[PDB]
Amino acid sequence: MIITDVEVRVFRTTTRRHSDSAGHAHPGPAHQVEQAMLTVRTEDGQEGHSFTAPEIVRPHVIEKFVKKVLIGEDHRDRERLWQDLAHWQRGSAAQLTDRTLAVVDCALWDLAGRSLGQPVYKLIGGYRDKVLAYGSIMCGDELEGGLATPEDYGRFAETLVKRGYKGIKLHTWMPPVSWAPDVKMDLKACAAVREAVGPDIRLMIDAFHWYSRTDALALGRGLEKLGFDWIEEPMDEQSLSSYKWLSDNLDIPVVGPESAAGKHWHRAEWIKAGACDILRTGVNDVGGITPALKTMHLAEAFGMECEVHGNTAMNLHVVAATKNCRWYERGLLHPFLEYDDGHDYLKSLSDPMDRDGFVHVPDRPGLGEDIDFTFIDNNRV
């Protein structure tokens, strides 16, 4: 159907999540944060929606790039439209980002699903209606009883096992935590968690993202003693060669790249060079559901797993449509916060999890985000 409108609505959500100056999430005081909803509408009035930070869909980007590509086009030509946006990034003075591509692609998928009364993963071609989640723990902090000590991680891990998680991923301490980073502290946290949960829970760590080769090597060696299942992004992913070196040295599987640019193209280079043992993708990291699927297929053709970064519907649907991914990433989690409480702007969870640790994909059309339109309207900026 012909796309007639692209609209952004900015509203305030009430949350206890804060992000530090380096972008890491932490629990803090309840406060209002601006959140944006992108809507694509067709001639018959059907809409698709997706959520992102206001800057990613600010008027500069919407007017200069997004509307020019989308308006007047058949909404179903997702490949053509994605490629059109992709070929405009180079000349965009660094303003047309993969994040912008992602929210646009997601809204187009939601539009197609809502139009047809079909969940996105079913339209793609379903693999699984439920999937194991790992509990993805927030970055370390200096909050007493929070994630300040190695024992704090151990205690929280016990809680996650009780909840039903069959896998747990630590994010350890990073600047601006005053004393961070420290390999020995990271390893103490990992050891506390292994001691707490025993050998039959799968454990992963996603550490400070800029350790030197020598520090990441020491971290990896320590993890092998604790039977961890993977090490994630312990070094600057801009150095492919460092990851090749680390993977060759470590027995423990290295997963990546999460944050590196270049979408599926650059991820092929990680396979080619042997820079990782497990690939990584994510809707936000590679510019949408469409390229995330490509990354999943790329990995599958090499007989590799590709673990999907990020919670929310958009990532869950990629995981549900593909086989070669062990988990959905559920979080980030913190003992001070109740993840299962959801968001004020959604009427129900996009990723409810049973007591056995399986997330069940909602049977709602599109991305299945149960949007509280009335709340958004009552809280506009």
Ligand X SMILES: O=C(NO)[C@@H](O)[C@H](O)[C@@H](O)C(=O)[O-]
Q: Which residues bind Cl ion (CB under 5 A)?
A: 1-2, 58-60, 74, 131-132, 340, 352-353, 373-374
# binding residues, a copy of itself (CB under 8 A): 41
**Angle at CA 160, nearest 5°, toward 256 and 341?**
95
287's torsion region: left (phi>0), alpha (psi -120 to 50) or beta?
Answer: left
Which does residue 239 bind out of a copy of itself, ligand X, Mg ion, none, counting CB within 5 to 8 angstroms by kind? a copy of itself
Which of 250, 276, 321, 332 is the binder for Mg ion (CB under 5 A)?
250
**Binding of a copy of itself by 171 (CB under 8 A):** no
**Binding of ligand X by 206 (CB under 6 A):** yes
CB of 52 to ligand X, least distance (A): 15
**Binding of a copy of itself by 297 (CB under 8 A):** no
CA–CA gap between residue 20 and residue 118 (Å, rounded): 38
CB of 78 to ligand X, least distance (A): 26
Q: Which of 165, 213, 217, 222 is nearest to 192 (CA)?
A: 222
Before 332, cis peptide (omega within 30)?
Answer: yes
343 is in an annotated binding site: yes
Interaction residues for a copy of itself, span 146-165 (CB under 8 A): none
SS3 state at 372: coil
Tokens in use for 24? 């890491």
# binding residues, ligand X (CB under 6 A): 11
Interaction residues for ligand X, span 29-88 (CB under 6 A): none
CB of 309 to ligand X, least distance (A): 5
CB of 354 to ligand X, least distance (A): 22
Which does residue 332 bind out of a copy of itself, ligand X, Mg ion, none, counting CB within 5 to 8 angstroms by kind? ligand X
Interaction residues for ligand X, span 160-199 (CB under 6 A): 171
Tell me whether residue 7 or residue 84 sits nearer to a copy of itself (CB atom).
84
Main-chain dihedrals φ then ψ at residue 84, nearest 5 degrees: -60, -45
Q: In terms of C-beta density within 10 A (0-12 exposed, 13-18 middle, 19 or more buried), how is residue 9 classed?
A: middle
Structural Rg of the chain based on CA atoms? 20
> Are 213 and 242 contacting, i.e. CB atoms less than 8 angstroms apart?
yes
CA–CA gap between residue 123 and residue 352 (Å, rounded): 21
Tell me whether residue 7 or residue 236 sits nearer to Cl ion (CB atom).
7
SS3 state at 12: strand
250 is in an annotated binding site: yes
Residue type present at position 281 = T
**Binding of Mg ion by 275 (CB under 5 A):** no
Tell me whether residue 168 or residue 332 sits nearer to ligand X (CB atom).
332
Interaction residues for Mg ion, span 183-222 (CB under 5 A): 206
335 is in an annotated binding site: yes
Other beta carbons within 10 angstroms of residue 319's beta carbon come to 27
β-bridge pairing 358-360 and 130-137 = antiparallel
SS3 state at 34: strand
Which of 23, 45, 125, 199 is the binder for a copy of itself (CB under 8 A)?
23
**Which DSSP helix (H) or strand (E) runs through 86?**
helix 78-89
70 is in an annotated binding site: no
Q: In the complex, which residues of this chain contact ligand X (CB under 6 A)?
A: 23-24, 91, 136, 139, 171, 206, 258, 309, 329, 332
Q: In the complex, which residues of this chain contact Mg ion (CB under 5 A)?
A: 206, 247, 250, 258, 335
Q: Which residues are annotated as a binding site?
A: 206, 232, 247, 250, 258, 335, 343, 346
